[model samples]
Target: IVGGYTCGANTVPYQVSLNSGYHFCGGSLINSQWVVSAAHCYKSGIQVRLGEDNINVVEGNEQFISASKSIVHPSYNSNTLNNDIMLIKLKSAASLNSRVASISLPTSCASAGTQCLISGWGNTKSSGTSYPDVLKCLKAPILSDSSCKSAYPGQITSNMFCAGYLEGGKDSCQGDSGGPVVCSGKLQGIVSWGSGCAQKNKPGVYTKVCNYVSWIKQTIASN
Candidate 1:
């Protein structure tokens, strides 16, 4: 994430890397057998790395699991980036431990000004190609829907929300898609898109996970 520091060890136990021999996107382990990510990140032959810290180094705590199946929201709009959430069923359940575990789904939608965490192995700068090897984390507050709409008129949807500083500094950038935005220990959002890494008046946009709680539970149960 741009303008973020290396996450403390085990600070993000539920964070996972979507790997194809390299970190591409981030995801949250929502259960022993299911992961929550962005629909745009869906691809065959993805390897999910749990308990991962550094993508370049093989931390012994990491668990590499193949994706058994990926179910993207049927209404996902690639062009508009709506309903960007997806569920990935793991071939094998990740065993819970100090370094690996599942995060709880949101009990309620995150309100404006709520402090949340955004972490990933994405680019550390707004421009150029500088991706971090270790997981980077930043704290951003949720912005109201009206503000988001004003920031990107006729673009922001109810399925998405904005979070970050209006003046710009820190944000989830490229390679951070599908990562979690944990608020009060609940998975509230999934990194989806943005105008830029951390541009003024363009806060990071995310897939509002609260709106998909039922879809997530139903899909996992039916599958």
Candidate 2:
């Protein structure tokens, strides 16, 4: 069941590999110099790779960039899963090319029912396991703000967006956390949570990308 939508699988611009073998779900090349991912994906002993798809097949051409600093959001709370974002500053900036570039971040939140794309290497079926190698992707329409608020009550905060098949059988699972949810070709969300992967009446929840624009800008500016 662990097969679904994936982006940058064939050409991952940046890679975060942990000593625990729990890699990052998704990452965005903010600049030639840095990558943005989830705070939960951060660890003390982690390696970042650039310009390669096959992580196991790193060769002479595949570039492995060492991280200069790994900064997790200070407000991150593992228990509550708040501020679950992080930035990795590379020791040196990568050379910008057609193959390695950043996706545009949305200036504001997208409207309800906006078509969005979700990409990850998570479970493909309900109650199943996660995919081991290939990443997956799918198209999901954003849910109405009111509908999302009603579905999760207080948990559906303004800092989040919701998407998934209302009938079920498509969503972000265990390994999908921190992945991208793009709308109109702009990064609008990051995979965050859901009641149970692909459960009926429970849509996938994502961190509102627009809400954290200031943080992202400031972080990149400081470094």
Candidate 3:
């Protein structure tokens, strides 16, 4: 898989690197107090570190917080990767600053073939000893479910969507899960699963954020 160009610090203000000891997964800061990520990315001791680009050192713009509540989707199926989404409420609301902000949510899905962006500090070669110390981003095309189903037969669900190249030159890798898939200036999807990193005919799968907007609203409202 191809690597993304390094992003300047705080370019993605809504971005949150969920660190499980080290950088494990990416998450989006939906609001001052809530974070959205993939359910599968969660572990026992994950923490949210925001407003930073480089994962290796502390930055003045960074804000570190503990998750007060982690709610995994009730219907998340690990076997099929259905409903692989989760919400994390911070113990205390994050203070707003130029380097820390929220991203807008999608009201609906973008058309097939639309270009979207995913960012994280994952391995560029899928798996390796070295990972990107700075945040990296790649642009990918959103593929129709019909096209994706052909590649990953009986795997793509309505709750999920596909994005990446069919030939697989650029795609999200191991540490990129739960990262935001931003399209048309809105949060469209969450990095979920794939058949290895950037494999040919196997685009990366994501949780369809638009499908669960109401649930997200309810989740935020009720909580």
Candidate 4:
């Protein structure tokens, strides 16, 4: 995350890294066997790493589990980035521990100006080649629908929302796609897209996860 701090050990146990040999995107552990991520980040041969703080180091608290299968939202539209959410079923249930756990999903939509926390192993700068090995975090408020739509006219949709400063200096970046935005201690957003990393008037856009709570439940139950 741009202009963020390294996360404290064990502070974000629900945070995870979606890997295909290396960290490609961030994800949140919603349950022992399920993870939530962005549809844009989906691919074959994914492995979920739980309790990871630094990507380059092998922390003992980490769990490496392969994905058994994944399901993207049926209404997902790649062109417009609508309903850009996906669920990955783990080959085996992740063992819960102090450094590995699940976060609760949002029950309702977050209102404007709700302070939310976003953490990931994304770039720390807007134009950087090297990404931080340690997880980074930023606390930004959710923007109103009107403000978000105005910022990206004809682009923002009900399935998406913007968060972070309009003046920039903080946001989820490349390699941070599919990360979580937790508000009031519940998963509310998924890092999906943005015009640029921490760019002015281009606040980070996230998949409005509240709109998919039922879909998530039904998919998990049916599969």
- TM-score per candidate, in order? 0.98, 0.85, 0.96, 0.98
Better of 2 and 3 by lDDT: 3
lDDT of 2 by residue, 71-170 (tens): 8887877766667778878777777665566677779789888887776555667765545455566788899888788778887666777887767777
Judge candidate 4 against the unseen true structure and give its global Cα lDDT, from 0 to 1. Answer: 0.93
Q: Which sequence of candidate numbers ranks them by lDDT, best first? A: 4, 1, 3, 2
The per-prediction tally of clashing pairs is 0, 10, 0, 0
Poorest stretch of ten by lDDT in candidate 1: 51-60
Better of 2 and 3 by TM-score: 3
Q: Model 4: per-residue lDDT, tens digit, 127-146? A: 86668888889999999999
2 versus 4: better lDDT goes to: 4
Which lDDT tens digits does candidate 1 get at residues 58-98?
76888999999999999999999999988999998889997
Candidate 3 regions with alpha-carbon error over 4 angstroms: 127-129
> Which portions of model 4 miss their true places by more than 4 Å?
none
Q: Between 3 and 4, whose lDDT is larger? A: 4
| Candidate number achieving the greatest lDDT relative to the actual structure | 4
- Local distance difference test, per candidate? 0.92, 0.69, 0.87, 0.93
| Model 3 TM | 0.96
TM-score of 2: 0.85
